[PDB]
Design a protein around this ligand. Structure first.
Ligand SMILES: CCCCCCCCCCCCCCCCCC(=O)OC[C@H](COP(=O)([O-])OCC(O)COP(=O)([O-])OC[C@@H](COC(=O)CCCCCCCCCCCCCCCCC)OC(=O)CCCCCCCCCCCCCCCCC)OC(=O)CCCCCCCCCCCCCCCCC
Ligand SMILES: CCCCCCCCCCCCCCCCCC(=O)OC[C@H](COP(=O)(O)OCCN)OC(=O)CCCCCCCCCCCCCCCCC
Ligand SMILES: CCCCCCCCCCCCCCCCCC(=O)OC[C@H](COP(=O)(O)OCCN)OC(=O)CCCCCCCCCCCCCCCCC
Ligand SMILES: CCCCCCCCCCCC(=O)OC[C@H](COP(=O)(O)OCC[N+](C)(C)C)OC(=O)CCCCCCCCCCC
Ligand SMILES: CCCCCCCCCCCC(=O)OC[C@H](COP(=O)(O)OCC[N+](C)(C)C)OC(=O)CCCCCCCCCCC
Lengths: 654, 83, 124, 174, 243, 90, 55
């Protein structure tokens, strides 16, 4: 019995066996097989996390050599650090609950053998991504989770938008993959290794300019997968994949990988201030940008994907404050939250006979679906950091730490993060109002046929409601202590502001996000029922503004017409005007015309005369004349006879 | 839905609604292979695992630092912040 | 014809119909085509630079003019960074001193040498 | 090995002369004309000769053979495409599977096995053993240590001295 | 197949065998010209792949882009670059004739027309062909555990040694090699099955045999590139000129 | 059996016989691999130092870390061609 | 409520048999060499390695 190996081997069994034996076992068997095997993986890693609180003594396993070359070795090495077990328990919990959930949500779909297979390989390459013990195994899992995201978003190959959406997702992630290959080449150049242990032992000695270059490249990678503003479209362009897929890819996992890259490199992020600065301001941008999209969009899955990427900015702000236990704790609780959000959303999309996604056409469903209501309201109250739930403990202390930090400029992002929190209320109130409380918008027959979902849909929502209530109070001592030795990362002694941040808060700045996140929530509710004209004005100017914030702060357009389409035109310029146009004029298509003209001239040189004898007899004369005159010119100066011969060639060949 | 499909095509992951008649019988074989493979690979990678901290005794690490200091003295190499 | 690169391709073509390029997405979906997914009838002449006017082409939004949307995007960009940069000036000072450290700022503890006390050192 | 008969093969060609071409013999979209041809398909499937005959015999027999096998080959595969013919089983050997699964695949597994075990003799294993040998040569007293100490003691010398001799090869520089 | 698997790697061999031993003092003066032409054939051929109507031609320009990655590990003056160019050359010799089989054998023998616009939704009538098309697509890009990424990675690393700024724009090849390949792959793999293509046979046993061999032989080099270091550890040190 | 071929150099030999030039070539090559295994040994010891030390690795093995980062530019494969085509001090 | 089964297929398809047989044979042979090396000091296939001496 080996705990470190069965975390690896059991989701490999759960992936290889659905493909190799899917025709032989059938869907009814492979459902329960892939389910129970991820269940026992998840139980083994809870028991290992229980062991690891006893002694902080991680276990690694060693394998054969990937490559030995001169100054560089790469081994397959697998090590569950405290950071690794933190991410691991979250992703295995969300995975196993989504397996149980998608048993019942996919029972009418044909191809759920391939579906449960791909869910399991997504979990498996996530496992290898988390538990790897150099930068190489991190890269292997990092690429193959993007490969799975191709294979998962495009699950209905018949649908055109699903194929183009998986294309968009993979090519954004591959942009980030290219910058991580740049950063990884500089890693193996400067340190001569890829192992975390050797790089972190010598990170403080290395020059700062190199360090800025490396962490810039690795942050552009992390910014691509963890969905900040530079390429942020592909999350909400990944709603063409189904609901349990989007419960994996957005709640914990594919999102969490980009944060994991910075949480690993935290030990080599300390010694540069410039990178952490830029990290902080990108995250502070996308809290605001994603909240302002989520207010004004209207599809349910889009609003929960934007609700996801509003808090990725919050974790990125916690990175920029040099506070990695905060970002890790928020990354932990956020997974349980969003997974309950996506699965409550899929339960109300599944329950409508229309299976529509427009919140404008849901209408009141409070008395018809009380269970999905109580789930989604536990999730929304945790989502707004209403106290006594773990969103309070994950989320409000980051807003506290923006004011508590030593540097002056951090005060500004307080308000920005603060503004997002108020924004975090309002759209959530919309996706609690217009689908449960409002007057009905749908036709009457779906209100006849609205019923409760199966037991396979109910039980993961129950379990993750309990987790999203109790997880922060249980694990707060681990990640937010007065002094904690759990996560082995090493903050510089001045970037550490956690004793400073808890005490320097005035009563107003701490009391203020609590009370206003309460008040604005009740405000949006009570203004949605009684008046409903403030939100339904028809000013021409507010409709242009609303249509800006609707269409993703026009970002997709600014991505598509000015980068994608211009790129395709300039690639069409090369493939025609350069590749087939001008390289053939110096190539085989211009030489044919040159030789055609020159041969036509030198063949028609002896054309004109009726008599061959007089022509050849006058052609013998010109040469022994002309050669003799050339040699007269030639012994005097050789420079004045070169143009004469160029002109004789011009007249002979043209 | 249950729209009709062509049965001539054979895919390894099953086809559209793959449900063979002997799926309990084949499930017995698949549980056998999965349990045997998991137990065998878990026992095979047992000696390749090790604890992180406390593998070698601290006197060795202090001696290694001493030999590092000797090799650094022989070459006359300055520290990083000495300038 | 309509685009600029389509006009740039015009003097190259010879005995080719030179039809109007129209997006295959902005065709209406309810007219019956041969392929509903392509939105294209069986023998319909394909345009000068077809694969930009394909169904597999870019998304090609239609609600804003692209120059206008360029202005709105750069406007939100500039107003956020300008508001944050001006709000750096209206900041309050803090009430604590940044905290100090024993053993002359733990300089021996973070590597360090007596000659290298300034590069690896804390507040003391 | 095996042997063929001349007269049977002449009679085979005499059977084939009265038969339609392969482009007509099955295009009729039963057993009046379609039952003599599936016999002939089994006649293609059976093998007339072994190795001992092809070496020792002349080329007129061989030309008669090659014409027979070509016509039987067409009558087998055209009837397999339009419609022994009227069966549907699984067990079959395409012409290539004899010398690709039984010669190409095991020689490729043999290439894998010799690459894996030839990788034992590498410069890095040998150079690690050589550097340990040089440390044991200069300082033999660490021989006197017990098993677990000796490796660690060797490391304390590898750090404490270069043990290359690369400056001794470059004797033209100093 | 013999052209793109073997002739291009023959000239990759000839730049090692013939030039790097007796043109060393020349070769240092000219590595920036080789880096001009190498970066300029990675960027500008992989960008011309996007506008293609034909289907074998795309895999051809793909071979150009991978050899353009390959030769800047050869002229990198590094142990890493030489070994990465060899593992790229051998792994591309595996993965690329399989792609010319997929365009030429399974897809031109059946329909006899190579225009891309006819081919859509090949999954619903040929599932295991679409399985091949995707796992040979991803093996071409530089998606790891395949040996193509080992070649691309050690070649880009060796090219980053000798000049870092040429390696910075040389590294975007990981993006540019993915764009056209997955743009082809999702057009072949997905959609409603094409109204032009009538349904034909599944991939036969001989074609699956060729494919299985040419994919295992990438995966073995991808999981462990050390299996052929026993041949090269002399010839990685041989061509290096660092005085 | 762990056989050890003898070291010869580039400077005493004649370059007209090929027996000695190839031996000097292989000798300089194999010595670079020995020098490289010394580098790898210190990298292994530095990793063990870090994993045992925990938080005080800054002062436990500043010398091992500085040792590794000083060895890394000068301990790699260098090539016999550069020394045999050019002669120092001539 | 019925599963609505498709026709029965056998477990040990020819591909499962071939791929499992070759992989288990290679792993068993590798363990056989690791066991044979402890007895005699060298692997079994190294007895078949006969190159010429470098001298
Ligand atoms: C460990 C060591 C293993 C090493 C690899 C072993 C390979 C095995 C080969 C084999 O079995 O024979 C099949 C092979 C022919 O394949 P085939 O099956 O006959 O295909 C014909 C029909 O298609 C086949 O029939 P079909 O008509 O039904 O076709 C359907 C097709 C399906 O159609 C498809 O769509 C295929 C999809 C693509 C697949 C192709 C890639 C193959 C995937 C590899 C698997 C990776 C798994 C992930 C990683 C896991 C790591 C192990 O079939 C498949 O491909 C299925 C393959 C997967 C089956 C796997 C089942 C194994 C179950 C294992 C259970 C474990 C039990 C444990 C119990 C424990 C109890 C103690 O014949 C050969 O022997 C070829 C020789 C290859 C040997 C390896 C190559 C070595 C040399 C490489 C070159 C050296 C390096 C380069 C040097 C360069 C110069 C320096
Ligand atoms: C600290 C600094 C912070 C910097 C932050 C700012 C970063 C901005 C840069 C963003 C670059 C994004 C990456 C560009 C490649 C992405 C490719 C892609 O995603 O294509 C998507 C497109 C399908 O998308 P679409 O059809 O529009 O919508 C589908 C949904 N139904 O798929 C296709 O149609 C496939 C065919 C088109 C593929 C693109 C071809 C041209 C590629 C040009 C790449 C240019 C790379 C250099 C960019 C320089 C930017 C300055
Ligand atoms: C470590 C290296 C990993 C190597 C992976 C080896 C996996 C080999 C087995 C893959 C077989 C996958 C498969 O058979 O899927 C078939 C699927 C059939 O489609 P289906 O849903 O049944 O609908 C049919 C409609 N007529 O066909 C499809 O629809 C296409 C989707 C194929 C899914 C492939 C899953 C594996 C991809 C791995 C990527 C590896 C990249 C290198
Ligand atoms: C896919 C899910 C993962 C499965 C993992 C199963 C682990 C089983 C135990 C590992 C034992 C081990 O590998 O040992 C390693 C052995 C001997 O090296 P060593 O020095 O003795 O030990 C190393 C430990 N050190 C460093 C502490 C000393 O070398 C090998 O085997 C390499 C053989 C490679 C063959 C080529 C790859 C073929 C793949 C083809 C795929 C189609
Ligand atoms: C700051 C700029 C916000 C104006 C954008 C807008 O247009 O705001 C309108 C939104 C949308 O409201 P709706 O429920 O989707 O009704 C849809 C009816 N339309 C389509 C006519 C709008 O109202 C809000 O929630 C934002 C008001 C609360 C902001 C925090 C106080």
């Amino acid at each position: 019995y080996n705990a470190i190996s069965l975390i690896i081997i059991l989701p490999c069994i759960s992936w290889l066996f659905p493909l190799f034996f899917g025709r032989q076992l059938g869907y009814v068997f492979v459902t329960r097989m892939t389910s129970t095997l991820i269940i026992i993986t998840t139980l083994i890693t809870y028991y290992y996390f229980y062991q690891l609180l006893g002694n902080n003594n991680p276990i690694n396993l060693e394998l054969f050599n990937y490559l030995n070359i001169d100054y560089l070795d790469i081994n397959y090495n697998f090590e569950i650090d405290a950071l690794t077990i933190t991410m691991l328990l979250a992703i295995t919990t969300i995975s196993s609950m989504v397996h149980i959930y998608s048993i019942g949500y996919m029972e009418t779909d044909p191809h759920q053998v391939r579906f449960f297979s791909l869910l399991s390989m997504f979990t498996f390459w996530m496992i290898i991504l988390v538990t790897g013990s150099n930068y190489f195994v991190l890269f292997v899992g990092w690429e193959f989770i993007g490969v799975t995201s191709y294979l998962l978003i495009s699950f209905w190959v018949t649908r055109l938008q699903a194929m183009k959406s998986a294309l968009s997702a993979v090519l954004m992630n591959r942009f980030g993959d290219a910058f991580f290959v740049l950063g990884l080449c500089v890693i193996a150049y400067v340190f001569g290794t890829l192992n975390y242990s050797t790089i972190f032992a010598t990170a403080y000695l290395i020059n700062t300019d190199l360090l800025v270059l490396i962490m810039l490249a690795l942050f552009i990678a992390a910014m691509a997968k963890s969905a900040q503003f530079g390429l942020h479209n592909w999350l909400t362009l990944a709603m063409e994949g189904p609901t349990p897929v989007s419960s994996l890819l957005h709640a914990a996992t594919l999102v969490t990988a980009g944060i994991y890259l910075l949480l690993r490199s935290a030990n080599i992020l300390e010694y540069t201030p410039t990178v952490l600065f830029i990290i902080l301001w990108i995250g502070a941008l996308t809290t605001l940008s994603a909240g302002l999209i989520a207010i004004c969009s209207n599809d349910l899955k889009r609003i929960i994907a934007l609700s996801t990427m509003s808090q990725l900015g919050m974790m990125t702000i916690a990175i920029g404050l040099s506070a990695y236990n905060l970002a890790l704790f928020h990354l932990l609780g956020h997974a349980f939250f969003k997974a309950l959000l996506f699965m409550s959303a899929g339960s109300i999309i599944h329950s409508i006979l229309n299976e529509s996604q427009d919140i404008r056409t849901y209408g009141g469903l409070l008395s018809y679906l009380p269970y999905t209501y109580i789930c989604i309201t536990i999730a929304s109250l945790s989502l707004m950091a209403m106290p006594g739930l773990t969103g309070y403990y994950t989320k409000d202390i980051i807003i506290e730490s923006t004011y508590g930090s030593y540097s002056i400029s951090n005060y500004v992002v307080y308000w920005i993060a603060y503004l997002s929190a108020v924004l975090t209320c309002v759209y959530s109130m919309k996706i609690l109002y217009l689908t449960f409380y409002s007057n009905p918008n749908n036709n009457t027959i779906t209100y006849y046929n609205a019923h409760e979902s199966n037991i396979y849909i109910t039980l993961p929502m129950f379990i993750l409601a309990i987790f999203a209530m109790f997880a922060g109070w249980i694990l707060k001592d681990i990640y937010l202590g007065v002094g904690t030795d759990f996560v082995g990362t090493h903050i510089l002694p001045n970037n550490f502001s956690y004793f400073d941040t808890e005490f320097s808060i005035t009563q107003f700045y701490k009391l203020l996000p609590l009370i206003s996140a309460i008040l604005v929530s009740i405000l949006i509710v009570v203004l949605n029922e009684f008046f409903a004209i403030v939100f339904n004005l028809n000013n021409k100017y507010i409709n242009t503004v609303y249509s800006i914030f609707n269409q993703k702060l026009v970002s997709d357009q600014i991505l598509n017409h000015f980068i994608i389409f211009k790129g395709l035109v300039t690639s069409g310029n090369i493939a025609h005007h350069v590749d087939k146009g001008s390289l053939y004029r110096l190539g085989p298509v211009g030489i044919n015309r040159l030789l055609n003209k020159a041969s036509y001239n030198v063949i028609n040189l002896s054309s004109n005369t009726r008599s061959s004898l007089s022509m050849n007899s006058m052609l013998i004369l010109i040469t022994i004349v002309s050669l003799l005159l050339l040699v007269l010119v030639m012994n005097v100066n050789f420079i004045i006879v070169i143009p004469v011969l160029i002109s004789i060639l011009y007249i002979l060949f043209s | 839905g249950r729209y009709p499909f062509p049965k001539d095509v054979i895919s390894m992951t099953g086809g559209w609604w793959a449900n063979p008649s002997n799926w309990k019988l084949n499930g017995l074989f698949a549980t056998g292979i999965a349990v045997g493979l998991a137990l065998w690979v878990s026992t095979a990678t047992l000696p390749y695992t090790r604890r992180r901290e406390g593998i070698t005794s601290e006197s060795d690490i202090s001696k290694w630092n001493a030999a590092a200091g000797v090799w650094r003295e022989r070459h006359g190499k300055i520290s990083t912040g000495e300038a | 014809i309509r685009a600029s690169f389509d006009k740039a391709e015009e003097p190259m073509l010879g005995d080719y119909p030179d039809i109007d390029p129209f997006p295959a997405q902005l065709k209406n979906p309810y007219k019956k085509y041969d392929d509903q997914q392509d939105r294209r009838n069986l023998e319909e002449p394909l345009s000068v630079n077809d694969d930009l006017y394909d169904m597999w082409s870019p998304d090609r939004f239609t609600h804003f003019k692209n120059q206008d949307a360029l202005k709105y995007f750069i406007g939100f960009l500039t107003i956020f960074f300008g508001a944050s940069y001006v709000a750096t000036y209206f900041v309050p000072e803090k009430a604590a001193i940044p905290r100090e450290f024993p053993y002359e700022g733990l300089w021996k503890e973070s590597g360090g040498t007596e000659k290298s006390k300034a590069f690896f050192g804390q507040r003391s | 090995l095996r042997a063929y008969n001349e007269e049977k093969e002449l009679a085979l060609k005499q059977r084939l002369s009265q038969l339609p071409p392969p482009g007509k013999a099955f295009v009729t979209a039963k057993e009046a004309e379609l039952a003599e041809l599936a016999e002939i398909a089994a006649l293609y499937k059976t093998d007339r000769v072994g190795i001992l005959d092809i070496l020792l015999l002349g080329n007129k027999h061989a030309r008669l053979y090659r014409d027979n096998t070509a016509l039987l080959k067409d009558y087998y595969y055209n009837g397999r495409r339009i419609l022994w013919e009227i069966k549907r089983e699984g067990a079959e050997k395409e012409d290539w599977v004899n010398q690709m699964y039984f010669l190409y695949a095991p020689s490729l597994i043999l290439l894998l096995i010799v690459m894996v075990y030839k990788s034992r003799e590498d410069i890095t294993f040998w150079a690690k053993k050589e550097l340990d040998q040089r440390v044991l040569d200069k300082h033999p007293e660490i021989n006197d240590a017990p098993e677990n100490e000796r490796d660690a003691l060797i490391v304390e010398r590898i750090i404490a001295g270069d043990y290359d001799k690369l400056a001794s090869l470059q004797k033209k520089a100093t | 197949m013999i052209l793109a698997g073997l002739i291009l790697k023959l000239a990759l061999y000839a730049i090692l065998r013939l030039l790097l031993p007796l043109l060393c003092e020349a070769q240092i003066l000219y590595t920036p010209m080789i880096y001009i032409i190498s970066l300029l054939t990675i960027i500008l051929t992989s960008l011309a792949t996007l506008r293609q109507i034909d289907l074998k031609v795309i895999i051809a320009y793909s071979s150009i882009s991978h050899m353009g990655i390959a030769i800047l590990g050869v002229c990198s003056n590094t142990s890493l670059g030489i070994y990465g160019s060899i593992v790229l050359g051998v792994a591309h010799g595996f993965v690329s004739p399989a792609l010319f089989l997929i365009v030429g054998g399974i897809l031109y023998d059946r329909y006899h027309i190579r225009i891309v616009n006819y081919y859509k939704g090949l999954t619903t009538y040929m599932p295991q062909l679409a399985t091949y098309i995707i796992i040979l697509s991803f093996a071409n890009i530089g998606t790891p555990l395949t040996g193509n990424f080992t070649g691309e990675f050690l070649s880009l690393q060796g090219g980053f040694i000798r000049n870092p700024i040429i390696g910075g724009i040389s590294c975007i090849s990981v993006l540019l090699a993915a764009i056209y390949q997955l743009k082809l792959t999702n057009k072949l793999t997905g959609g409603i099955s094409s109204i032009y293509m009538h349904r034909t046979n599944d991939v036969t046993i001989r074609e699956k045999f060729i494919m299985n061999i040419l994919i295992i032989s990438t995966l073995i080099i991808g999981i462990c590139p050390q299996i052929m270091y026993n041949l090269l550890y002399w010839t990685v040190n041989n061509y290096i000129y660092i005085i | 059996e762990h056989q050890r071929p003898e070291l010869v150099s580039f400077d005493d030999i004649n370059y007209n016989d090929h027996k000695k030039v190839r031996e000097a070539q292989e000798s300089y090559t194999r010595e670079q691999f020995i020098r490289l295994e010394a580098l790898k040994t210190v990298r292994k010891a530095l990793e063990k130092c870090y994993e045992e030390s925990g938080p005080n690795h800054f002062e436990d093995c500043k010398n091992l870390a500085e040792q590794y980062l000083d060895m890394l530019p000068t301990h790699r494969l260098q090539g016999y061609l550069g020394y045999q085509r050019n002669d120092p001090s001539k | 409520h019925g599963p609505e089964l498709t026709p029965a297929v056998p477990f040990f398809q020819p591909y499962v048999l071939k791929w499992a047989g070759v992989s288990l044979g290679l792993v068993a042979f590798y363990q056989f060499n690791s066991s044979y090396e402890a007895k005699n000091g060298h692997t079994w296939v190294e007895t078949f390695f006969h190159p010429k001496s470098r001298e």
